[PDB]
RNA sequence: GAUAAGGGAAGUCGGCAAAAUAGAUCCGUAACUUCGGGAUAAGGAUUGGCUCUAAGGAUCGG
RNA sequence: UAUCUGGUUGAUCCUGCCAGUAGUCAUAUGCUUGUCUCAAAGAUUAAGCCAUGCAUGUCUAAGUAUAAGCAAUUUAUACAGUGAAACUGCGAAUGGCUCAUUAAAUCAGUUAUCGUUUAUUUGAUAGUAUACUUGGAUAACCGUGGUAAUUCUAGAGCUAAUACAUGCUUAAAAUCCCGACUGUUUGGAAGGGAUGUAUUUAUUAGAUAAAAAUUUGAUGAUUCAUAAUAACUUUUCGAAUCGCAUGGCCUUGUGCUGGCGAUGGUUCAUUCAAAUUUCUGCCCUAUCAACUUUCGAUGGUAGGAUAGUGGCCUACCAUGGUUUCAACGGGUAACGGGGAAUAAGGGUUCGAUUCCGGAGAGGGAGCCUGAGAAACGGCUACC
RNA sequence: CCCGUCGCUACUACCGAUUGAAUGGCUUAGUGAGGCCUCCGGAUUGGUUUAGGGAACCGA
């Protein structure tokens, strides 16, 4: 069994430690989910204490939040474009935490147009919109992407732990950072 | 003597790890799994006996198989099962239609009938009423204990209001 | 080892139970309950070794299965129920009420009280915090959780519980001059007033306590139980001896004069 | 030395800087006091480094034992080794012998330590195979 | 000049003849020793095609 | 009892050992042996192998009874007393034995969990935006059996649940979003959705140095408790259960209400625990001086996994980490400690063994169930 | 008094061809049972259940 104990390692002085006891069940590990993109398939795992975990083996959509306006919508994920841990994860389009993905922009464009009245990519309702006006100008580098119809996002949930693939839309210098990293 | 297991497509024997819910095995303790040899699902010459079920009755009577019949040993026991099998609508009283098998102990005979399950009775309705009355009374006890604490807090806060003004 | 232990060796039982070595191999292992194992008193020990009502464990079980014994106003049928400090035991068949208070000699005294005092008990607040739906609550030393406490209550105070509604009758704030009984260490059972609290953050606060005989001792804050608002005014009756520790020479002289 | 020197973006968790805000374009910084009367260095209030294991801006907590020792190596990235000297009593000879133990502690960029300083380190949760302590105070040597 | 089931020197004075090994990269390498060797000791792993990535330079412009 | 005596020489004084002397909770053995109390006992060599028998099962008024079981006619033609066998629930992870492995390992004293899970016990905690009560299986049983053989089980006919899967019954407002119309200086609005609790994200309260030109908890300390917003979910559970009593209301009913109990259920706390964990402390050996780092060794970033921290594992990147204050290696006729023998004091020797901790059930390894096992009087595979 | 070859008897350890032998630990390389996760698979077995012979699509 996969074991997380530190006994099998050699000590800080470099001495090999002798075998103390048989592997115990309270230090087990399991195998990575390696979440892909495909029709949703989640398997439950019975964990210590009788609790439940959900392995997302394949998912298509997730709930992603646009932080500045504070609104979240569920949208499909197109693919993985960047992963700080392993490039084989980008190549196989494996969903893990902190993975950079492209998400569908329609729910956010629709919310934006209904809430502010402007477009992207580049009586009472009208009064509410006129009041909300002025705050409707967003950053150019984020606005330009809606023209391509795909937003950059990072997964925040842990799909191998909860079966969900949720995240937030990149903005500010974090967005500038991953654009520079991606383009190189 | 090894029995046949459905889905194993062989005329021979294979060894499987059988568990609870599998045929050809009865687990002795909870969670126990045994590796047992079982015969495939393909008919061959190595069978000592084959079990057959008559789907369509033939021409000639079978001596002890198609002429007689054995009544079912037990009647229905659940209330909705009594309603479904034969005899009544939801407004009928199931209590006096249950089949009772009478036993003969020498000279005096008495009847035995099953205990009906899922039968609505005044005790059942009393328990339902008790549960909902307790739930409502509890909800009121909680929301007035909360209201009383809100009075206590308002009094303390008012006292702290005058305390700051004084100091 | 692979799960919780269910036996208790006689030699490994708490010493303040005063069990004899040779009556057998095992001792009553207290059940899970309001009080910790080392600081509790099982009802079999209370009813058989102290009160001597039962001659053996079969008889104590016969006694308890007739619904006579009540702890904190509720009938208990668990023979190894972990009764503990300040708990009230009622035996209405004999019409007797006991309180489990430590005596100054370190053991649980059998301190009988009248029914009027047996109608309540005190509990030291271990923590106060907010529960679900934003309801604050206090957890006492016997594991009780009482919601909607007086907003002035903080940790280490002592509350007086109505014990029939589970509500708070009144409380004592932790401060200088309060009467205290010590519930741990070698000074177990002594009663005095707090003279000075010396705090040690990230560590253990220490409390300096002055006895009624002007004896001063120091103990950890976790072993301090406030039982009265000032000297000579305890909220519960003290056991015989009034929690005053005498040296062995004074005890020997007192015993000689009392018996001759 | 730059903060975004890794293949991943370095930032404090759950600290959100809203781009649609006022002209006060200063990156929001989170910090905490470790308690026990230890002062937060101003390099944490005014700095820009990101360290999840740092006592003041990270999620570790200081609890347990407080030890002092001499820094003997700064050749690891963000990790030091301190040396603790003590006297062991040998009852048979009614005398003592010098002994020492090496304890590995994490040092945040809010402190600058070189070999020879005497530091005070507080215990934290296990943050590595050999590192379980985290520097709280530095005295120049 | 080739191949050959199973065995593998039982053939023969004798392993005669044939077979097996073989290039390169990486790992590893004993007794003994005249300290130079033994040594390619012994004993192991890899090797194609295709699509990429990185490193290694020159001349001009202060 | 803080003690000494014989032995080298022809004789002497010394160094020095041999011998004598006493104890042993220290074993064996020889001889002898009347009484009372107390009482060790396959540790040493073989953690070698085992014939045979036993050591873990369990039912109350309160889960399931048509035994074709017993008993009596009784408040009873639904059952009602007693009661095998089975299904369901729980226990079997405790105990008992042994000390093989194990030398910073175990363990001892001392810490921490603001780094986690926790059956059970004990406290609290749920009005939430077909209903007089939902489904279809299955056991025991009967009768056809196959094998020499097992705690093997297969066809066929029934039939149950606190087993399995679904599903209503209900307060009063209030708040939020969209919003046709309308007022038309930005208000009013018909109509639609959403509110409990769990899960997963993202974003906000969660304050507290003393005068001039409204609330806000704890800690030494937190991104804590808790609350709110936007969404999300192969939708967790907000009782389709069981026993005794039968009370109260009369606008002529199997009407509406209700008393003491069993069990279960979400979350928080507690307890019994568990898992990691700080500091310091282990016998001999240098005829062991360098060890660790291919292929994790030390650290960083990101991830995966875990109940959770952590190179526990993966990817990328640095070259670190231990050591004459003895690392590393080797030996141990080594389970550790509380303790035991002997002892003026200081010490020397022993500690498998009545208590505590750890480990094992021929040797490894891998798992199911379960709160809890890498369990062996559980399973799977190899030797 | 006494020393050493040489000669006799007994015992102990050492060296010693045998690429001697046995047991245990660690380990390179090759093969690799079995469990677990995953991937399809779809024996048979219930109907989201629809249908005038029954042709679809849902679950296990
Ligand atoms: Mg051939
Ligand atoms: Mg061949
Ligand atoms: Mg050959
Ligand atoms: Mg020959
Ligand atoms: Mg020949
Ligand atoms: Mg010859
Ligand atoms: Mg020749
Ligand atoms: Mg030749
Ligand atoms: Mg050679
Ligand atoms: Mg070679
Ligand atoms: Mg290749
Ligand atoms: Mg002697
Ligand atoms: Mg033996
Ligand atoms: Mg045990
Ligand atoms: Mg015994
Ligand atoms: Mg990590
Ligand atoms: Mg021992
Ligand atoms: Mg031994
Ligand atoms: Mg033991
Ligand atoms: Mg085992
Ligand atoms: Mg020899």
Swiss-Prot record, chain C:
Subcellular location: Cytoplasm
Single GO biological process annotation from the record: translation
Record keywords: Cytoplasm, Ribonucleoprotein, Ribosomal protein, RNA-binding, rRNA-binding
Coarse class of the protein's main subcellular location: cytoplasm
Domain KOW: 177-210
Domain S4 RNA-binding, first and last residues per copy: 41-104
Domain of life, per lineage: Eukaryota
Keyword set includes Coiled coil: no
SMART domains given in the database record: S4
One GO MF term: rRNA binding
Gene3D superfamilies: 2.30.30.30, 2.40.50.740, RNA-binding S4 domain
One Pfam family cited in the UniProt record for this chain: KOW
InterPro entries given in the database record: KOW (IPR005824), Rib_uL2_dom2 (IPR014722), Ribosomal_eS4 (IPR000876), Ribosomal_eS4_C (IPR032277), Ribosomal_eS4_central_region (IPR013845), Ribosomal_eS4_central_sf (IPR038237), Ribosomal_eS4_KOW (IPR041982), Ribosomal_eS4_N (IPR013843)
Cellular component annotations (GO), alphabetically ordered: cytosolic small ribosomal subunit
Purpose of the protein: Component of the ribosome, a large ribonucleoprotein complex responsible for the synthesis of proteins in the cell. The small ribosomal subunit (SSU) binds messenger RNAs (mRNAs) and translates the encoded message by selecting cognate aminoacyl-transfer RNA (tRNA) molecules. The large subunit (LSU) contains the ribosomal catalytic site termed the peptidyl transferase center (PTC), which catalyzes the formation of peptide bonds, thereby polymerizing the amino acids delivered by tRNAs into a polypeptide chain.
Record note on quaternary structure: Component of the small ribosomal subunit. Mature ribosomes consist of a small (40S) and a large (60S) subunit. The 40S subunit contains about 32 different proteins and 1 molecule of RNA (18S). The 60S subunit contains 45 different proteins and 3 molecules of RNA (25S, 5.8S and 5S).
Recorded family membership: Belongs to the eukaryotic ribosomal protein eS4 family.
Listed HAMAP family: Ribosomal_eS4
The protein, known as: Small ribosomal subunit protein eS4
UniProtKB/Swiss-Prot annotation, chain D:
Signal peptide: none
Protein name listed in UniProt: Small ribosomal subunit protein uS17
Domain of life: Eukaryota
Function: Component of the ribosome, a large ribonucleoprotein complex responsible for the synthesis of proteins in the cell. The small ribosomal subunit (SSU) binds messenger RNAs (mRNAs) and translates the encoded message by selecting cognate aminoacyl-transfer RNA (tRNA) molecules. The large subunit (LSU) contains the ribosomal catalytic site termed the peptidyl transferase center (PTC), which catalyzes the formation of peptide bonds, thereby polymerizing the amino acids delivered by tRNAs into a polypeptide chain.
GO BP annotations listed: translation
Record note on quaternary structure: Component of the small ribosomal subunit. Mature ribosomes consist of a small (40S) and a large (60S) subunit. The 40S subunit contains about 32 different proteins and 1 molecule of RNA (18S). The 60S subunit contains 45 different proteins and 3 molecules of RNA (25S, 5.8S and 5S).
Gene3D superfamilies: 2.40.50.1000
SUPFAM superfamilies, per database record: Nucleic acid-binding proteins
Protein family (similarity comment): Belongs to the universal ribosomal protein uS17 family.
Main subcellular localisation: cytoplasm
GO MF terms, alphabetically ordered: structural constituent of ribosome
Pfam families in the cross-refs: Ribosomal_S17, Ribosomal_S17_N
Subcellular location(s) per record: Cytoplasm
Keywords: Cytoplasm, Ribonucleoprotein, Ribosomal protein
Gene Ontology cellular-component annotations: cytosolic small ribosomal subunit
InterPro entries reported in the protein's UniProt record: NA-bd_OB-fold (IPR012340), Ribosomal_uS17 (IPR000266), Ribosomal_uS17_arc/euk (IPR028333), Ribosomal_uS17_CS (IPR019979), Ribosomal_uS17_N (IPR032440)
């Amino acid at each position: 069994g996969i074991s997380r104990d530190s006994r099998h390692k050699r000590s800080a002085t470099g001495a090999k430690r002798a075998q103390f006891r048989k592997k115990r069940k309270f230090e087990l590990g399991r195998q990575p989910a390696n979440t892909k993109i495909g029709p949703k398939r989640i398997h439950s795992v019975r964990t210590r204490g009788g609790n439940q975990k959900f392995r997302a083996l394949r998912v298509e959509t997730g709930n992603f939040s646009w932080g500045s306006e504070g609104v979240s919508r569920k949208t499909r994920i197109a693919g993985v474009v960047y992963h700080p841990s392993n490039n084989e994860l980008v190549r196989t389009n494996t969903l893990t935490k902190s993975a950079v993905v492209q998400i569908d922009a329609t729910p956010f464009r629709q919310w934006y147009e209904n809430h502010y009245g402007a477009t992207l990519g580049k009586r009472k309702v009208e009064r509410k919109l006129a009041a909300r006006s002025g705050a409707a100008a967003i950053e150019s580098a984020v606005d330009s992407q809606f023209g391509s119809g795909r937003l950059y996002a990072v997964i925040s949930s842990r799909p191998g732990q909860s079966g969900r693939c949720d995240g937030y839309i990149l903005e500010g210098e974090e967005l500038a950072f991953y654009l520079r990293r991606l383009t190189a | 003597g090894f029995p046949m297991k459905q889905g194993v497509m062989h005329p021979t024997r294979v060894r499987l790890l059988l568990s609870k819910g599998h045929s050809c095995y009865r687990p002795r303790r909870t969670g126990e799994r045994k590796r047992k040899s079982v015969r495939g699902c393909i008919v061959a010459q190595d069978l000592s006996v084959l079990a057959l079920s008559i789907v369509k009755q033939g021409d000639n009577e079978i001596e002890g198989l198609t002429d007689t019949t054995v009544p079912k040993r037990l009647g229905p026991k659940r209330a909705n099962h009594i309603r479904k099998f034969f005899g009544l609508t939801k407004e009928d009283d199931v209590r006096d239609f249950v089949v009772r098998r009478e036993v003969t102990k020498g000279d005096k005979t008495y009847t035995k009938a099953p205990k009906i399950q899922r039968l609505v009775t005044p005790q059942t309705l009393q328990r339902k009423r008790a549960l909902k009355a307790k739930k409502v009374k509890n909800a009121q006890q909680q929301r007035d204990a909360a209201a009383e604490y809100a009075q206590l807090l308002a009094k303390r806060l008012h006292e702290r209001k005058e305390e700051r003004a004084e100091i | 080892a692979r799960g919780p232990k269910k036996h208790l060796k006689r030699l490994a039982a708490p010493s303040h139970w005063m069990l004899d070595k040779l009556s057998g191999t095992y001792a009553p292992r207290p059940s899970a309950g309001p009080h910790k194992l080392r600081e509790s008193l099982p009802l079999v020990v209370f009813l058989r070794n102290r009160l001597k009502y039962a001659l053996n464990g079969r008889e104590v079980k016969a006694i308890m299965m007739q619904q006579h014994v009540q702890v904190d106003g509720k009938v208990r049928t668990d023979t190894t129920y972990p009764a503990g400090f300040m708990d009230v035991i009622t035996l209405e068949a004999t019409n007797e009420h006991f309180r489990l208070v430590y005596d100054v000699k370190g053991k649980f005294a059998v301190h009988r009280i009248s029914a009027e005092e047996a109608a309540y008990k005190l509990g030291k607040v271990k923590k106060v915090q907010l529960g679900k739906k934003g309801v604050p609550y206090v957890v006492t030393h016997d594991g009780r959780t009482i919601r909607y406490p007086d907003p002035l209550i903080r940790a280490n105070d002592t509350v007086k519980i109505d014990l029939a509604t589970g509500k708070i009758d009144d409380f004592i704030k932790f401060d200088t001059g309060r009467l205290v009984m010590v519930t741990g260490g070698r000074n177990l059972g002594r009663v005095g007033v707090i003279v000075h609290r010396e705090k040690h953050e990230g560590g253990f606060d220490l409390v300096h306590i002055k006895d009624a005989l002007e004896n001063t001792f120091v103990t950890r804050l976790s072993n301090v139980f406030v039982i009265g608002t000032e000297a000579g005014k305890p909220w519960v009756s003290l056991p015989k001896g009034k929690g005053i520790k005498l040296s062995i020479s004074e005890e020997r002289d007192r015993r000689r004069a009392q018996q001759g | 030395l730059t903060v975004q020197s890794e293949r991943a973006f370095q930032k404090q968790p759950h600290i959100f800087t809203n781009p649609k805000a006022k002209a006060n374009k200063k990156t929001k910084r989170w910090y905490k006091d470790v308690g026990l009367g230890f002062k937060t260095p101003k390099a944490a209030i005014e700095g820009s480094y990101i360290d999840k294991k740092c006592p003041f801006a990270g999620t570790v907590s200081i609890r347990g034992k407080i030890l002092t020792g001499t820094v003997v190596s700064t050749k690891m990235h963000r990790t030091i080794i301190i040396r603790r000297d003590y006297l062991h009593y040998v009852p048979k000879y009614n005398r003592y012998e010098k002994r020492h133990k090496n304890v590995a502690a994490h040092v945040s960029p809010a402190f600058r330590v070189e070999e020879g300083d005497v530091v005070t380190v507080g215990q934290c949760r296990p943050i590595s195979k050999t590192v379980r302590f985290n520097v709280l105070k530095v005295s120049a040597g």
